[PDB]
Amino acid sequence: DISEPPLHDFYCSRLLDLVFLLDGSSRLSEAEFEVLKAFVVDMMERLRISQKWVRVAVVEYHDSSHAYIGLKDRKRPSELRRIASQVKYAGSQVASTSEVLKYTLFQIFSKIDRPEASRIALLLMASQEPQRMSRNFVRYVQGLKKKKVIVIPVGIGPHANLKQIRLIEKQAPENKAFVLSSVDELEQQRDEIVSYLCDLAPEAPPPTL
Ligand SMILES: [Cl-]
């Protein structure tokens, strides 16, 4: 038994696999990265986290991707939120969006054994990868598109890869971007982002018998 009641009245109770992808570069200071994690935790509090409802994954990406939470991890929501809150600051020279989308496509959504859930990757971006790393970027985004993995880029600050964000937006109509000036704007956009992605996901049918 690992179920927990909602903390808030605002609560997504739909069939959803939601992946948080966190920029691990030094474009975010340690303090800004704490705000980014607080946003992720705030969003998690507003999800009904359960294998039967909303599943979550949390990945920090630098030149490679490090998963802290996988969709299949059967832990209490509060423990998942604690894990997210403690994601270590990397401050890397490089954060590769191409590598983390590859990770999402071939490690997270490799095997679609939950066909009843919508699949969304929230790509929190504050930087630009070296162009040498981007050869397959469009191919991974298209691979995700074909598995109906909706990619929602959140561009934070002026160093965010806006060219890639626009590329993501054009691959699928549901791939909506949120472009923010700084991590301090995350809190005021949070419930709008939650509502947008909740609306994308299927409802569970009314309980019977
Ligand atoms: Cl009934």
CA distance 183 to 167: 22
Q: Measure 89 CA to ligand 1 centroid, in angstroms.
A: 50
If one counts the domains in the chain, the total is 1
Q: How was this structure determined?
A: X-ray
CATH number at residue 185: 3.40.50.410
DSSP E strand stretches across 131-192 = 149-156, 178-180
- Starting at the edge strand that comes first in sequence, how are the strands of the sheet with 178-180 ordered? 65-69, 54-61, 16-23, 118-125, 149-156, 178-180
Rounded to 10 deg, the angle between the 77-85 and 30-45 helix axes is: 170
Largest CA-CA distance found in the chain, in angstroms, rounded: 57
- CA atoms within 13 A of residue 206's CA, in its CB half-sphere: 2
CA distance 105 to 171: 15
- To which H or E segment does residue 43 belong? helix 30-45
- Strands 149-156 and 118-125: what pairing? parallel
Q: Please identify every residue whose CB atom is under 5 Å from ligand 1, which is an ion.
A: 208-209
- To which H or E segment does residue 54 belong? strand 54-61
Q: Measure 206 CA to ligand 1 centroid, in angstroms.
A: 9
Q: How far is CA 84 from the centre of its chain?
A: 12
**Resolution for this model in angstroms, one decimal place?**
1.6
Q: Measure 209 CA to ligand 1 centroid, in angstroms.
A: 3
Q: Which residues pair with 150 in a beta bridge?
A: 120
Q: Measure 208 CA to ligand 1 centroid, in angstroms.
A: 4
Residue 148, classified by CB atoms within 10 Å of its CB into exposed (0-12), middle (13-18) or buried (19+), is middle
Range of the domain at 11: 1-209
> What does DSSP assign to residue 138?
H
CA dihedral over 78, 80, 81, 86, signed as positive or negative:
positive
